[PDB]
Design an enzyme around this catalytic site. Structure first.
Site, PDB file in Angstrom:
ATOM      1  N   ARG A   1       9.705  -3.573 -10.114  1.00  0.00           N
ATOM      2  CA  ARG A   1       8.331  -3.068 -10.099  1.00  0.00           C
ATOM      3  C   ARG A   1       8.181  -1.565  -9.827  1.00  0.00           C
ATOM      4  NH1 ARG A   1       5.190  -6.620  -5.984  1.00  0.00           N
ATOM      5  NH2 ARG A   1       7.253  -7.356  -5.300  1.00  0.00           N
TER       6      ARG A   1
ATOM      7  N   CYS B   1       8.991  -9.955  -9.095  1.00  0.00           N
ATOM      8  CA  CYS B   1       9.696  -8.929  -9.861  1.00  0.00           C
ATOM      9  C   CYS B   1      10.403  -7.893  -8.987  1.00  0.00           C
ATOM     10  CB  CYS B   1       8.754  -8.220 -10.835  1.00  0.00           C
ATOM     11  SG  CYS B   1       9.492  -6.762 -11.594  1.00  0.00           S
TER      12      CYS B   1
ATOM     13  N   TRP C   1      13.969  -4.639 -19.045  1.00  0.00           N
ATOM     14  CA  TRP C   1      15.370  -4.879 -19.362  1.00  0.00           C
ATOM     15  C   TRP C   1      15.945  -5.935 -18.428  1.00  0.00           C
ATOM     16  CZ3 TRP C   1      13.796   0.304 -18.534  1.00  0.00           C
ATOM     17  CH2 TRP C   1      13.828   0.709 -17.197  1.00  0.00           C
TER      18      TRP C   1
ATOM     19  N   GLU D   1      20.683 -12.317 -14.204  1.00  0.00           N
ATOM     20  CA  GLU D   1      19.904 -13.277 -14.980  1.00  0.00           C
ATOM     21  C   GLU D   1      20.765 -13.911 -16.066  1.00  0.00           C
ATOM     22  OE1 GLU D   1      15.679 -12.192 -15.891  1.00  0.00           O
ATOM     23  OE2 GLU D   1      16.368 -10.159 -15.415  1.00  0.00           O
TER      24      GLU D   1
HETATM   25  C1  HEM Z   1      12.049  -2.960 -16.089  1.00  0.00           C
HETATM   26  C2  HEM Z   1      12.866  -4.013 -16.077  1.00  0.00           C
HETATM   27  C3  HEM Z   1      12.607  -5.223 -15.267  1.00  0.00           C
HETATM   28  C4  HEM Z   1      13.509  -5.872 -14.489  1.00  0.00           C
HETATM   29  C5  HEM Z   1      14.946  -5.473 -14.291  1.00  0.00           C
HETATM   30  C6  HEM Z   1      12.849  -6.979 -13.900  1.00  0.00           C
HETATM   31  C7  HEM Z   1      13.501  -7.857 -13.042  1.00  0.00           C
HETATM   32  C8  HEM Z   1      12.944  -9.089 -12.813  1.00  0.00           C
HETATM   33  C9  HEM Z   1      13.697 -10.220 -12.465  1.00  0.00           C
HETATM   34  C10 HEM Z   1      15.186 -10.273 -12.262  1.00  0.00           C
HETATM   35  C11 HEM Z   1      12.847 -11.257 -12.332  1.00  0.00           C
HETATM   36  C12 HEM Z   1      13.248 -12.662 -11.955  1.00  0.00           C
HETATM   37  C13 HEM Z   1      13.239 -13.552 -13.199  1.00  0.00           C
HETATM   38  C14 HEM Z   1      13.988 -14.843 -12.988  1.00  0.00           C
HETATM   39  O1  HEM Z   1      14.755 -14.982 -12.010  1.00  0.00           O
HETATM   40  O2  HEM Z   1      13.852 -15.777 -13.811  1.00  0.00           O
HETATM   41  C15 HEM Z   1      11.553 -10.775 -12.605  1.00  0.00           C
HETATM   42  C16 HEM Z   1      10.450 -11.584 -12.559  1.00  0.00           C
HETATM   43  C17 HEM Z   1       9.258 -11.123 -13.072  1.00  0.00           C
HETATM   44  N1  HEM Z   1       8.985  -9.925 -13.611  1.00  0.00           N
HETATM   45 FE1  HEM Z   1      10.103  -8.433 -13.760  1.00  0.00          FE
HETATM   46  N2  HEM Z   1      11.581  -7.041 -14.326  1.00  0.00           N
HETATM   47  C18 HEM Z   1      11.347  -5.991 -15.142  1.00  0.00           C
HETATM   48  C19 HEM Z   1      10.183  -5.614 -15.817  1.00  0.00           C
HETATM   49  C20 HEM Z   1       9.004  -6.339 -15.772  1.00  0.00           C
HETATM   50  C21 HEM Z   1       7.870  -6.123 -16.568  1.00  0.00           C
HETATM   51  C22 HEM Z   1       7.741  -5.044 -17.612  1.00  0.00           C
HETATM   52  C23 HEM Z   1       6.912  -7.066 -16.207  1.00  0.00           C
HETATM   53  C24 HEM Z   1       5.555  -7.234 -16.778  1.00  0.00           C
HETATM   54  C25 HEM Z   1       4.706  -6.231 -16.997  1.00  0.00           C
HETATM   55  C26 HEM Z   1       7.497  -7.863 -15.178  1.00  0.00           C
HETATM   56  C27 HEM Z   1       6.909  -8.925 -14.542  1.00  0.00           C
HETATM   57  C28 HEM Z   1       7.682  -9.934 -13.955  1.00  0.00           C
HETATM   58  C29 HEM Z   1       7.099 -11.243 -13.661  1.00  0.00           C
HETATM   59  C30 HEM Z   1       5.686 -11.701 -13.914  1.00  0.00           C
HETATM   60  C31 HEM Z   1       8.071 -11.980 -13.117  1.00  0.00           C
HETATM   61  C32 HEM Z   1       7.934 -13.403 -12.648  1.00  0.00           C
HETATM   62  C33 HEM Z   1       8.283 -14.366 -13.782  1.00  0.00           C
HETATM   63  C34 HEM Z   1       8.371 -15.786 -13.281  1.00  0.00           C
HETATM   64  O3  HEM Z   1       7.481 -16.240 -12.529  1.00  0.00           O
HETATM   65  O4  HEM Z   1       9.325 -16.519 -13.627  1.00  0.00           O
HETATM   66  N3  HEM Z   1       8.756  -7.387 -14.942  1.00  0.00           N
HETATM   67  N4  HEM Z   1      11.615  -9.429 -12.915  1.00  0.00           N
HETATM   68  N1  LIG Z   2      14.286  -8.658 -16.641  1.00  0.00           N
HETATM   69  C1  LIG Z   2      13.142  -9.542 -16.619  1.00  0.00           C
HETATM   70  C2  LIG Z   2      11.827  -9.016 -16.656  1.00  0.00           C
HETATM   71  C3  LIG Z   2      10.751  -9.894 -16.631  1.00  0.00           C
HETATM   72  C4  LIG Z   2      11.006 -11.325 -16.577  1.00  0.00           C
HETATM   73  C5  LIG Z   2       9.893 -12.247 -16.554  1.00  0.00           C
HETATM   74  C6  LIG Z   2      10.140 -13.652 -16.503  1.00  0.00           C
HETATM   75  C7  LIG Z   2      11.465 -14.148 -16.473  1.00  0.00           C
HETATM   76  C8  LIG Z   2      11.716 -15.622 -16.416  1.00  0.00           C
HETATM   77  N2  LIG Z   2      10.549 -16.287 -15.895  1.00  0.00           N
HETATM   78  C9  LIG Z   2      10.562 -17.671 -16.279  1.00  0.00           C
HETATM   79  C10 LIG Z   2      11.674 -18.419 -15.544  1.00  0.00           C
HETATM   80  C11 LIG Z   2      11.526 -19.964 -15.699  1.00  0.00           C
HETATM   81  C12 LIG Z   2      12.629 -20.537 -16.699  1.00  0.00           C
HETATM   82  C13 LIG Z   2      12.372 -20.602 -18.048  1.00  0.00           C
HETATM   83  C14 LIG Z   2      13.356 -21.100 -18.908  1.00  0.00           C
HETATM   84  C15 LIG Z   2      14.558 -21.506 -18.387  1.00  0.00           C
HETATM   85  N3  LIG Z   2      14.786 -21.429 -17.067  1.00  0.00           N
HETATM   86  C16 LIG Z   2      13.855 -20.955 -16.220  1.00  0.00           C
HETATM   87  C17 LIG Z   2      12.547 -13.256 -16.496  1.00  0.00           C
HETATM   88  C18 LIG Z   2      12.294 -11.798 -16.547  1.00  0.00           C
HETATM   89  N4  LIG Z   2      13.350 -10.897 -16.568  1.00  0.00           N
HETATM   90 CL   LIG Z   3      16.096 -14.905 -19.424  1.00  0.00          CL
END
Ligand code: HEM
Ligand SMILES: Nc1ccc2ccc(CNCCCc3cccnc3)cc2n1
Ligand SMILES: [Cl-]
Ligand code: HEM
Ligand SMILES: Nc1ccc2ccc(CNCCCc3cccnc3)cc2n1
Ligand SMILES: C[C@H](O)[C@H](O)[C@H]1CNc2nc(N)[nH]c(=O)c2N1
Ligand SMILES: C[C@H](O)[C@H](O)[C@H]1CNc2nc(N)[nH]c(=O)c2N1
Ligand SMILES: [Cl-]
Lengths: 362, 362
Positions: free
Chosen positions: A68, A65, A237, A242
């Site tokens: 964070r 993330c 958000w 993305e």
């Molecule tokens: C505040 C706005 C937030 C932004 C802009 C943000 C941004 C991102 C982005 C861009 C990713 C990559 C996702 C992808 O490429 O598919 C990500 C992954 C992740 N975010 Fe955040 N995030 C936010 C809030 C949060 C929140 C609220 C949580 C949970 C409490 C969180 C937990 C995660 C987790 C667990 C992943 C990994 C998901 C995966 O393995 O595919 N994020 N975040």
């Molecule tokens: N802005 C954010 C915040 C939290 C997020 C958490 C998770 C994801 C996407 N994780 C799963 C990606 C795997 C996937 C699933 C379906 C299609 N293509 C790839 C985004 C977040 N964005």
């Molecule tokens: Cl998405």
């Protein structure tokens, strides 16, 4: 055995959580209560404060993330009291409503009852609460290919989409005891969608692109102190990349770059002309502009990277060890223009955290 | 001890090299000759064929190289006969000349005598044979900051640059026995430079940007069968991103993006406008256009990625294990538009290979 693993994880968590909360002296008479409750019941029940903080600690330890920095402002809704699917559904409706917040998105997480002895109380099938359907049948490719499996599963259960490229999937979850999941069509009034336009290219609307306002991930397992909240949908958000560089750009998704190149008036004939790179930029400018123009929260990858550097500084300032996934932290466009590219991160997994889990479908 | 390590590495190499050459039966009477020569002399001497192939095997095992498809067409110049610095210099002059090839770049490597018993025979100080100087002194930042250390070292030895942003550094190397390295100014006739212009923005020339035609890396250690060719300058051609997205784009390098944004007529005020991303594209289009327009070899990151996929297919077709560095293989612009982003690679190090080594300066 399963009683021991829980005790070890809980000891590590309670000590640390109370350490951060400033209740370091309360650790001992709490671990005892847990030590008994574990032995007698097989599990322990979190207090409202540990769970709220545990969900914040889990976001902080998400190596992938980029957002964070705001881990502590997470709005935690404690719904461990739900027993019926009308409560589950309403809570999910409410989550959409309160997280959206008229466009000014609140990072929110709703926490449902955790697994008792490996047994799920609630089992959410949706990847995200709001997500478009996908159809593949005899040359037909409609909607989001990423949603093909779930869509087919929902259509096995009586649901039917209008087969547009942007069909809202229903909420679909399964309660403990029931064999099949139930599904509920989403009230359109609760869902904000953003039509993609361009600041100075009026021909861009001819693509008729749009995306949903709030990404609410609902198929990840929140793990706090040996307790597995398999059903805990959270949201933040969008970072513009993305949508503009992955969801709407990937060939194995919406595959819109040639169409973008056409409407922005450049040729898509030569690699040396960098038309994919140019289309990716104008589409990503379009996504950010469209979201701002409507009044829905969104961040660009540069600002997000700046914020994440502050998170790195905040962590260093707190004596906290930093963990991160470089391959996921770098944005898919101009990653070298961010500080993330030019340093390394320790991809070690610290709990509390969020984990992938197996899909009940497919 | 050092006799054993050499024997183990040589056994692995000769067996494999001859295996690929189709001389699998010649392996045994060759290992004996080596087994003796090692015991009697402390080292062994490669044949012209093993070294030519060993240098090709080393390029193939470079986990970070995106251009490994053409590993077998590498032109290998065997200069293990050099004894004087006029021979070293002329060979380096010749390398520039033959690798450049009037603009149609030949992937070439010149191999100098290897370390005997850890002792270098020749010690090249240049990172690349052709590279611009860099100056930092009291608010002054002129040239390439990456060249600051070497530049200061060269000026400690009697050399003086004109202090333009594109001062050609001299060749500087040290022979076995001599305390200080010698330096030779590069003949301008041997160096191709490319002025950066834009296909449709005539104001782009006002930036007065340029880069050198051929990147000839001269500070890496080629290791073939326990033999350390610490002095083996090699070259290919440029992938446009190296120049347009890193050399001329990084803040810790030439830092030209605001200037690019100004001449391409867009504002550099807001992150949400994606001006860095937009400037990066037009600058990278400019680099590719400028090189093609002159007649100097260059590849774009998309074509290179396509070629690297063929290399992946060629390897699979040959029963050869593939190794790669994902973090280095992805291009710094639009990496998600390449297949590299969407798969993983094994970053294991196989020999023969090219390695970093400590700088004699700084
Ligand atoms: C505040 C706005 C937030 C932004 C802009 C943000 C941004 C991102 C982005 C861009 C990713 C990559 C996702 C992808 O490429 O598919 C990500 C992954 C992740 N975010 Fe955040 N995030 C936010 C809030 C949060 C929140 C609220 C949580 C949970 C409490 C969180 C937990 C995660 C987790 C667990 C992943 C990994 C998901 C995966 O393995 O595919 N994020 N975040
Ligand atoms: N802005 C954010 C915040 C939290 C997020 C958490 C998770 C994801 C996407 N994780 C799963 C990606 C795997 C996937 C699933 C379906 C299609 N293509 C790839 C985004 C977040 N964005
Ligand atoms: Cl998405
Ligand atoms: C044919 C043209 C070639 C292209 C387009 C190419 C492309 C690249 C690129 C883009 C990099 C990344 C460099 C960086 O980001 O700083 C790279 C790294 C590398 N290439 Fe190649 N390459 C080519 C030929 C060669 C040749 C001829 C060799 C040697 C025989 C070679 C060996 C390497 C090595 C060792 C690295 C890693 C250098 C490091 O660690 O910084 N490549 N290549
Ligand atoms: N087109 C090619 C072919 C081969 C290459 C081999 C090496 C390099 C650069 N490697 C060293 C990067 C470390 C560095 C040095 C100075 C300033 N910044 C970074 C490029 C190649 N390109
Ligand atoms: C192989 C690689 O891990 C995979 O393609 C990753 C790369 N980095 C990523 N980074 C983000 N943010 N999102 C992704 O889906 C991926 N995919
Ligand atoms: C920390 C990280 O390894 C470092 O910044 C790398 C990332 N990937 C790269 N990839 C290439 N091609 N060139 C580089 O200089 C780097 N830098
Ligand atoms: Cl370079």
């Amino acid at each position: 055995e399963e009683k021991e693993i829980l005790w070890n994880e809980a000891k590590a968590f309670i000590a640390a959580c109370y350490q951060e909360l400033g209740k370091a002296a309360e650790v001992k008479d709490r671990l005892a209560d847990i030590k008994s409750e574990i032995d007698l019941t097989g599990s322990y029940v979190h207090t409202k404060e540990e769970l709220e903080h545990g969900a914040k600690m889990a976001w902080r330890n998400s190596n992938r993330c980029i957002g964070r920095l705001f881990w502590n402002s997470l709005n935690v809704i404690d719904r461990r009291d739900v027993r019926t699917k009308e409560e589950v559904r309403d809570a999910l409706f409410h989550h959409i409503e309160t997280a959206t917040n008229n466009g000014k998105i609140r990072p929110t997480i709703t926490i449902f009852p955790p697994e008792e002895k490996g047994e799920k109380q609630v089992e959410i099938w949706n990847h995200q609460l709001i997500r478009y359907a996908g159809y593949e049948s005899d040359g037909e490719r409609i909607g989001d290919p990423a949603s093909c499996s779930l869509t087919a599963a929902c259509e096995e259960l009586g649901w039917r989409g209008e087969r547009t490229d942007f069909d809202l999937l229903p909420l679909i979850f399964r309660m403990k005891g029931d064999e099949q999941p139930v599904w509920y069509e989403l009230p359109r009034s609760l869902v904000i969608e953003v039509p993609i336009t361009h600041p100075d290219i009026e021909a861009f609307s001819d693509l008729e692109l749009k995306w949903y306002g709030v990404p609410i991930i609902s198929d990840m397992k929140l793990e706090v102190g040996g307790i597995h909240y398999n059903a805990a949908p959270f949201n933040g958000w969008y970072m513009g990349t993305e949508i503009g560089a992955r969801n709407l750009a990937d060939e194995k998704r919406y595959d819109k770059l040639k169409k973008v190149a056409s409407v922005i008036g450049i040729a898509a004939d030569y690699n040396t002309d960098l038309w994919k790179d140019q289309a990716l930029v104008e589409l990503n400018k379009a996504v950010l502009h469209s979201y701002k123009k409507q009044g829905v929260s969104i961040v660009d990858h540069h600002t997000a990277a700046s914020q994440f550097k502050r998170f790195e500084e905040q962590a260093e300032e707190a004596g906290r060890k930093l963990t991160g996934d470089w391959t996921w932290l770098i944005p898919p466009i101009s990653p070298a223009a961010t500080h993330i590219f030019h340093r390394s991160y320790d991809n070690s997994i610290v709990k509390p955290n969020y984990f992938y889990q197996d899909k009940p479908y497919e």
